[PDB]
Ligand binder design. Structure first.
Ligand SMILES: Cc1cn([C@H]2C[C@H](OP(=O)(O)O)[C@@H](COP(=O)(O)O)O2)c(=O)[nH]c1=O
Ligand SMILES: [Ca+2]
Length: 129
């Protein structure tokens, strides 16, 4: 995989972030994770965690996997990095996301995130408490 430049347009919720990528507004859905909806328990915290994380970053990078790059709603499907720290992995580590939507095309960082979910569960963090 490789990291590509992008600039925040807007944080949306725990696992979707609108960015400008190669000149175009594009809504990104985070690969391999599922944050609760804003109206569910931990939703607002998931949204706020992702928001602070993308908003504080000086450098945002987008990383496509090997499978499909857009979902059926036209959302980019990526691993997202804030100053070199992967948001996807970071939500899971804090028990603000579950590992999810693991499809065959698109799972490079699957074990990494499951590793994080193991440690999150280990500590009864947010969702696991
Ligand atoms: C994360 C992800 C979601 N999706 C689709 C499947 C789900 O379809 P359905 O809407 O038919 O359930 C939806 C879940 O996203 P949200 O969790 O943002 O709702 O997005 C993909 O197709 N590929 C992916 O990698
Ligand atoms: Ca979700």
């Amino acid at each position: 995989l490789h990291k590509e430049p992008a600039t925040l347009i807007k944080a949306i919720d725990g696992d979707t972030v609108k960015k400008m990528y190669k000149g175009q507004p594009m809504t990104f859905r985070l690969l391999l994770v599922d944050t609760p909806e804003f109206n569910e328990k931990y939703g607002p915290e998931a949204s706020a965690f992702t928001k602070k994380m993308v908003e504080n970053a000086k450098k945002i990078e987008v990383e496509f996997d090997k499978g499909q790059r857009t979902d059926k709603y036209g959302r980019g499907l990526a691993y997202i990095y804030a100053d070199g720290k992967m948001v996807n992995e970071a939500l899971v580590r804090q028990g603000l996301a579950k590992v999810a939507y693991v499809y065959k095309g698109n799972n490079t960082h699957e074990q990494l995130l499951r590793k994080a979910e193991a440690q999150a569960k280990k500590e009864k963090l947010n969702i696991w408490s």
